[PDB]
């Protein structure tokens, strides 16, 4: 009766379905897969990547960047929603091959520094190659790259270092306010009385309020289905998208229903 | 006209005035200096150290531990109020010579991991030897060592990872509630509109409320004068001590007066 | 045509076949599996663990330590042959649950710090949870725990930080010289002209000489079959064991034959 | 009788005497001070910095880079001779302000990661702000930036991670072979029987041989006086420079004389 074999982190095939760059605004592009968001922001002094997807998407991300005429040495900064394997996967590899820097909060940095191991909820089930954060950022801090300002809004819950990012792009000269909000889901989390996360419910609730007040004309999420995006239909991909008010309100209903039946 | 020489971190002589162990409760001992708190908690399965003082206090701390009959290999865990050079100084050296582990929150851990460099307010002026946190702890988490439970209460302000520690000791069988609260001071901090700490005032204000609600019969602070302790007078050292309500209220008045004249 | 799924590191079932502690000398015990070595050395002031095996062996190792009456807080130090997933697997978990310290050379430490990712030969195929080395040790340095002295002998090759450990135990008062030598194999390695390891052949050759001159009356290896141990047969497990001279000489023949046909 | 105050690392004033860029070859420039070498190599795809000097030279280095028309975001890579405070001082600050990457061997990386603390010979006397290495390089590995190839040659001694760097520049179309060799000095080191560095003498001796065989038409050292450079006299600065054979031979004589009188 030998000990069990290691099991790999296997996801849906749509999460790994490569797609060509889809334009969101004048400078923002979706370069991930059909069901996993990876945002590229092209500026005058370099490019910014927000999330990367699964660990095996590093090559694909570099291909799409090459399609936009962004050389590896042109990727200046990597930003994260939260340091889980399905969003921060290729960060370590992308750092070795692009010469980019990684800005994250303290909670995301320590999790990224241990490759997602010892997760508060998942343990060691979803390990990815570890990467080191180069710059610790605080709640409400401003990151500027080539004239575009990225504001961090801490929204703890899914992970302690969950972050929503907001910046103002243009839609052919028309200023658009874009908010990239993190996941508000608690898949399988023990919500009440979790010894690894005592103030979990208080963090989630305040985070629901933080997403509602985001300056946002167009919302995006690490999973496009969470904000009702559909990357397949190209031009019509943002048609049935959700506001921030709808996003936080629908996520809270699921949280409360889950919180209620957890007591049963 | 050469570039200026490096300058060392020099403190008051009372901060480095060694003192014999002073008993606080049945298991809690003060083993630091006259004006710098270093708390030793002796249990059945090992000892816990809360803060260490200046970097040059490592030898003195080990001497006082030897006086209490605590061998180096008996120090099991090191806890921190905040990872500044005058409180977390000897941590790196104490880890090499005691085989102890260090529990800290994410914000304190990243600061401890870079030896206090790149401080949000002090820059590189107060560098100390870096040490690595072994266990990341969350707000309200419980650390237990030999039957004594240590609860963490996040109180950001002085540093982003400022933590107050509470535990229940005895005073000859009589249960006493001890709270070791961090500094609530902002010495020279730019409070309003600090780009390195945008939500600084909101963190301080909520932290004033957090210290008021601490379960506490006897309060201690990293600087004994802040809670009106006087380690010199031995038995009478806790006579004119302050409550948590008085501590947070007096610190807030100074904060507001400082906040008010900062606008001038 | 989606991107391929992650694959887990799967090994032979004998590598994960738990076994009861098998005594090697008066203080040295084998507490790993049938085909994976994990050595426990019990002293007067604590215990030392050499290697741990696969990542999923942490619980089993703690059980065997409990069988020898070694509490988790009695494990003082963890030593490594090399920081590959099949030998340094449970180190990160064993540190969280035993309060132990990890001594390794610089090369092993950086590899352990990135969880075996970005391997010089294996890439990211064999990732394990990352752990941090607490004490950097040099070639020929002495580690002492409870009167037993452990000498490190650098033997680069399999990994840049490969280390053989030697110490003198007793066999009922009779002093025995034990050498725990690392693997001398290069499974699938590109030997000549490897850009990630330019001086690879020079390191291997000098390492063959280093193992020959080890003070050794009884040799052990991370894979028991490499030194012709057979952990199943209990008392007869060390019968057909190899000397250090035979071990290094047989490994060199395979290296040269592999080096010769690599040119073809 | 209080404990002593911390003391700062104070050097000679010539070590901090800023100087304008002095041209060494078509692409190599000296941008440090009069008695501390900091080499800038300008290529088609970016710039490379070799060493930085004292920690307070970060601003000066960026000024000289601005004089050569090298923006901060144009510094792609930082290379180190050894991670002591007087050569690797501004690395941490230069990483935050240039978006550059740091390549170092394992031994230099761990020392750089702890800010030079716990030195094998100096203890905590010469602490500098810690920085993290982004890419671990092996002995003889090739680093290429914009068509210029940098070869690492490990030469342990002064520190375990001491590295000499060689590359081929031009002197108006004429190919020149430049070797930047590390210090071969052991100032105050205990050479024979040092428990922190057991094989110290063997490392130094083999390192004397490694510097002799360096492909070198023009040698430079972290301290210009060690190779008989004189940065003050501008055009005549490389007049009385030493070969590699002379450099290693003169350093060995001092080592042996020091080794001989250490036995007395
Ligand atoms: C770690 O990755 C996730 N979880 C899993 O893949 C497994 C472990 C599972 O929960 O079944 C996780 O969190 N995600 C999110 C998210 O909203 O972030 C959603 C929607 C669910 O999928 C990924
Ligand atoms: C970094 O150490 C401190 N600051 C200094 O020593 C210098 C830099 C200074 O501010 O003049 C700091 O913070 N302390 C506290 C505290 O309450 O924590 C008090 C009361 C003031 O002294 C120390
Ligand atoms: C990373 O673990 C090893 N390699 C593998 O499991 C796969 C990747 C494989 O090479 O097929 C590795 O090295 N080992 C050794 C050793 O001597 O250390 C031997 C004998 C072969 O197995 C393990
Ligand atoms: C750590 O910096 C050094 N040492 C000191 O500054 C003090 C501590 C001292 O030894 O008196 C050190 O090593 N250097 C070298 C070198 O060759 O690298 C030389 C020539 C001497 O100066 C610097
Ligand atoms: Zn997730
Ligand atoms: Zn997800
Ligand atoms: Zn402080
Ligand atoms: Zn203080
Ligand atoms: Zn291996
Ligand atoms: Zn193996
Ligand atoms: Zn030096
Ligand atoms: Zn020097």
- Concatenated DSSP letters of A65-130: HHHTT--GGGEEEEE-S---TTTBTTHHHHHHHH--EEEE-HHHHHHHHTTT-SBTTTBTTT----
* Cα distance between residue D150 and residue D27, in whole Å: 13
Q: Describe chain A by its helix, strand, coil percentages, rounded to 5.
A: 30, 25, 45
Q: Is A60 a catalytic residue?
A: no
* Cα distance between residue D113 and residue C5, in whole Å: 35
Residue nearest to atom 17 of ligand 3 (CA): C183
Q: Is D223 a catalytic residue?
A: yes
Residues of chain B in contact with residue A136, where contact means CB-CB under 8 angstroms, are: 110
Residue nearest to atom 21 of ligand 4 (CA): D187
Question: Which chain D residue shows the shortest CA-CA distance from A99?
Answer: D101
Atom number, ligand 4, closest to the C-alpha of residue D126 = 1
Residues of chain A in contact with residue B138, where contact means CB-CB under 8 angstroms, are: 120, 160, 196-199
Contacts of A202 (CB under 8 A, 6+ apart): none
Subunit contact C132:B135, Cβ cutoff 8 A: no
Is the CB of residue A219 less than 8 Å from the CB of residue A181? Answer: yes
* Cα distance between residue D199 and residue D185, in whole Å: 16
Q: Give the helix/strand (H/E) hosting D174.
A: strand D174-180
SS3 state at C50: strand
Q: Is C189 a catalytic residue?
A: yes
* Cα distance between residue A130 and residue C111, in whole Å: 11
Residues of chain C in contact with residue B143, where contact means CB-CB under 8 angstroms, are: none
Query: Is A84 known as a binding-site position?
Result: yes
D121 CB near ligand 4 (under 6 Å): no
* Cα distance between residue A1 and residue C202, in whole Å: 43
Subunit contact C138:D198, Cβ cutoff 8 A: yes
D182, two tokens: 């590390």
The rounded Å distance from CA C162 to ligand 3 centre is 14
Contacts of A264 (CB under 8 A, 6+ apart): none
Is the CB of residue C112 less than 8 Å from the CB of residue D112? Answer: no
For helices D91-98 and D58-67, give the axis angle rounded to 10 degrees: 50
* Cα distance between residue C73 and residue C89, in whole Å: 20
Angular region, D193: left φ>0, alpha ψ -120 to 50, beta rest = left
* Cα distance between residue D185 and residue D183, in whole Å: 6
The DSSP 8-state label assigned to residue A136 in this structure reads E
Q: Give the helix/strand (H/E) hosting C42.
A: strand C39-42
Q: Show which of residues 198-227 on chain B sit within 8 Å of chain A, judged by CB atoms.
A: 198-199
Q: How many helices (H) and strands (E) does chain B have?
A: 5, 12
* Cα distance between residue C78 and residue A179, in whole Å: 47
The rounded Å distance from CA B183 to ligand 8 centre is 7
Subunit contact B139:A109, Cβ cutoff 8 A: no
* Cα distance between residue C115 and residue C108, in whole Å: 10
Q: Is A153 a catalytic residue?
A: no
SS3 state at C115: coil
Bridge partners of A30? A22, A39
* Cα distance between residue D235 and residue D232, in whole Å: 9
Q: HSE of A251 in the Cβ direction (CA atoms, 13 Å)?
A: 30
Nearest CA to CA, how far is C89 from chain A (Å)?
A: 11
How is chain C split into domains, by residue range? 1-264
Polymer length of chain B? 264
* Sign of the Cα pseudo-torsion (B33, B37, B42, B46, in order): negative
Angle, CA B99 vertex, CA B147 and CA D195 arms, to 5°: 165
The alpha carbons of chain C give a radius of gyration, in whole angstroms, of: 18
- Choosing from D187, D188, D204, D251 the residue with most ligand 4 atoms within 8 A of its CB, the one to mutate for a pocket test is D187
Contacts of B79 (CB under 8 A, 6+ apart): B48, B49, B50, B51, B102, B103, B104, B143, B150, B163, B165
Residues of chain A in contact with residue C7, where contact means CB-CB under 8 angstroms, are: 8
B145, two tokens: 């060592």
Q: Is C158 a catalytic residue?
A: yes
Strands (E), chain D: 22-23, 28-30, 39-42, 47-50, 75-79, 101-104, 135-136, 142-145, 148-154, 163-171, 174-180, 218-220
Q: How many CB pairs under 8 A join B and D?
A: 98
How far apart, in Å, are the Cα atoms of D248 and each of C34, D93, D184, D206, D262?
52, 33, 8, 11, 21
Residue with tokens 């693997």: C183
Q: How many C-beta atoms lie closer than 10 Å to residue B52's C-beta? A: 27
Bridge partners of B169? B176
Residue nearest to atom 3 of ligand 4 (CA): D86
Is the CB of residue C179 less than 8 Å from the CB of residue C159? Answer: no
* Cα distance between residue B118 and residue B116, in whole Å: 7
- The residue from C86, C119, C169, C182 that is catalytic is C86
SS3 state at B239: coil
Q: Give the pocket of ligand 1 (CB within 6 Å).
A: A 11, 84-86, 122, 126, 158, 183, 185, 187-188, 223
The DSSP 8-state label assigned to residue B183 in this structure reads P
Q: Give the helix/strand (H/E) hosting D61.
A: helix D58-67
Among partner residues D107, D139, D195, which is closest to C142 by beta-carbon distance? D195
* Cα distance between residue B142 and residue C90, in whole Å: 24
For residue D17, which of D51, D54, D49, D50 has the smallest C-alpha distance? D54
Subunit contact C45:B96, Cβ cutoff 8 A: no
Residues of chain A in contact with residue D134, where contact means CB-CB under 8 angstroms, are: 95-96, 132
Q: Show which of residues 78-97 on chain D sit within 8 Å of chain A, judged by CB atoms.
A: 95-96
Strands (E), chain B: 22-23, 28-30, 39-42, 47-50, 75-79, 101-104, 135-136, 142-145, 148-154, 163-171, 174-180, 218-220
- The residue from A134, A203, A223, A249 that is catalytic is A223
B56, two tokens: 């040059």
A193: phi then psi, degrees, rounded to nearest 5: 75, 35
Is the CB of residue B189 less than 8 Å from the CB of residue B157? Answer: no
Question: Which chain A residue shows the shortest CA-CA distance from C5?
Answer: A10
Cα first-last separation, chain B: 36
Classify residue C43 as exposed, middle or buried by CB count within 10 Å of its CB (0-12, 13-18, 19+): middle
How far apart, in Å, are the Cα atoms of A173 and each of A48, A67, A176, A217, A256?
20, 23, 9, 15, 42
Q: Inform me whether the C-beta atom of residue C135 falls under 8 Å from chain D C-beta atoms.
A: no
Q: How many C-beta atoms lie closer than 10 Å to residue B213's C-beta? A: 11
D140 CB near ligand 4 (under 6 Å): no
Angle, CA C139 vertex, CA C135 and CA C143 arms, to 5°: 50
For residue B203, which of A8, A138, D237 has the smallest C-alpha distance? A138
Subunit contact C138:D196, Cβ cutoff 8 A: yes
Is the CB of residue A220 less than 8 Å from the CB of residue A24? Answer: yes
Cα first-last separation, chain A: 36
Is the CB of residue C54 less than 8 Å from the CB of residue C26? Answer: no
Q: Is D87 a catalytic residue?
A: yes
Question: Which chain D residue shows the shortest CA-CA distance from C152?
Answer: D198
Is the CB of residue D51 less than 8 Å from the CB of residue D87? Answer: yes
Q: Which residues surround ligand 8, an ion (CB under 5 A)?
A: B 86
B14 CB near ligand 2 (under 6 Å): no
* Cα distance between residue A32 and residue A28, in whole Å: 12
Subunit contact A128:C127, Cβ cutoff 8 A: yes
- The residue from B128, B169, B180, B189 that is catalytic is B189
Contacts of D256 (CB under 8 A, 6+ apart): none
Subunit contact B99:C99, Cβ cutoff 8 A: yes
The alpha carbons of chain D give a radius of gyration, in whole angstroms, of: 18
Atom number, ligand 1, closest to the C-alpha of residue A9 = 6
β-pairing, D101-104 with D135-136? parallel
Is the CB of residue A244 less than 8 Å from the CB of residue A181? Answer: yes
Q: Give the helix/strand (H/E) hosting A198.
A: none
- The residue from C128, C189, C197, C231 that is catalytic is C189
Nearest CA to CA, how far is A111 from chain B (Å)?
A: 9
Max CA-CA distance within chain B?
A: 67
Most D CBs within 10 Å, among A131, A134, A147, to test the D interface: A134
* Cα distance between residue C158 and residue C116, in whole Å: 13
Q: HSE of A79 in the Cβ direction (CA atoms, 13 Å)?
A: 30
Is the CB of residue B54 less than 8 Å from the CB of residue B34? Answer: no
* Cα distance between residue C179 and residue C213, in whole Å: 11
Question: Which chain C residue shows the shortest CA-CA distance from B74?
Answer: C73
Residue with tokens 């990547």: A49
SS3 state at D77: strand
Nearest CA to CA, how far is A73 from chain D (Å)?
A: 8
Polymer length of chain C? 264
How far apart, in Å, are the Cα atoms of C109 and each of C222, D106, D107?
18, 8, 10
Is the CB of residue C42 less than 8 Å from the CB of residue C25? Answer: no
Q: Which method, experimentally, gave rise to this model?
A: X-ray
Residue nearest to atom 10 of ligand 3 (CA): C187
Strands (E), D22-65: 22-23, 28-30, 39-42, 47-50
Q: HSE of A194 in the Cβ direction (CA atoms, 13 Å)?
A: 24
Is the CB of residue D50 less than 8 Å from the CB of residue D39? Answer: yes
Residue nearest to atom 2 of ligand 4 (CA): D86
Q: How many C-beta atoms lie closer than 10 Å to residue D20's C-beta? A: 11
β-pairing, B101-104 with B135-136? parallel
Q: Which residues surround ligand 6, an ion (CB under 5 A)?
A: A 86
For residue C176, which of C184, C185, C166 has the smallest C-alpha distance? C166
C197, two tokens: 């390891």
B205: phi then psi, degrees, rounded to nearest 5: -60, -50
Residue with tokens 């490897």: C194
C92: phi then psi, degrees, rounded to nearest 5: -60, -45
Residue with tokens 């860029």: D21
For residue C248, which of C176, C126, C153 has the smallest C-alpha distance? C153
Is the CB of residue B40 less than 8 Å from the CB of residue B66? Answer: no
Question: Which chain B residue shows the shortest CA-CA distance from D93?
Answer: B118
**Binding-site residue ranges of B for Zn(2+):** 82, 84, 86-87, 158, 223
Q: HSE of C99 in the Cβ direction (CA atoms, 13 Å)?
A: 24
A199: phi then psi, degrees, rounded to nearest 5: -90, 40
Distance, CA of B143 to chain centre: 16
């Amino acid at each position: 009766a030998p000990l069990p074999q290691l099991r790999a982190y296997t996801v849906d095939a749509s999460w790994l379905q490569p797609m060509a760059p889809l334009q969101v605004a004048d400078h923002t592009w979706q370069i991930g897969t059909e069901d996993l968001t990876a945002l590229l922001v092209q500026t005058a002094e370099g490019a910014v990547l927000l999330d990367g997807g699964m660990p095996q998407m590093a090559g694909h991300l570099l291909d799409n960047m090459k399609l936009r005429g962004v050389a590896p040495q042109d990727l200046r900064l990597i930003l994260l929603s939260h340091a889980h394997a399905d969003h921060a996967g290729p960060v370590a590899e992308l750092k070795r091959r692009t010469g980019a820097h990684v800005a994250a909060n303290a909670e995301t940095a320590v999790l990224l520094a241990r490759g997602g191991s010892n997760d508060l909820h998942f343990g060691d089930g979803i390990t990815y190659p570890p990467a080191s954060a180069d710059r610790i950022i605080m709640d409400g801090e401003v990151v500027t790259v080539g004239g575009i300002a990225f504001t961090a809004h801490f929204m703890p819950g899914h992970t302690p270092g969950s972050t929503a990012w907001t910046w103002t792009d243009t839609r052919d000269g028309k200023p658009v306010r874009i908010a990239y909000a993190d996941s508000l889901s608690a898949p399988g989390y023990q919500l009440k009385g979790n010894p690894r996360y005592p103030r979990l419910i208080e963090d989630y609730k305040r985070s629901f309020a933080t997403v509602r007040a985001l300056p946002c004309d167009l919302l995006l999420t690490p999973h496009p289905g969470a904000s009702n995006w559909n990357y397949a239909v190209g031009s019509k991909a943002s048609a049935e998208a959700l506001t921030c008010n709808a996003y936080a309100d629908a996520a809270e209903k699921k949280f409360d229903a889950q919180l209620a039946r957890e007591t049963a």
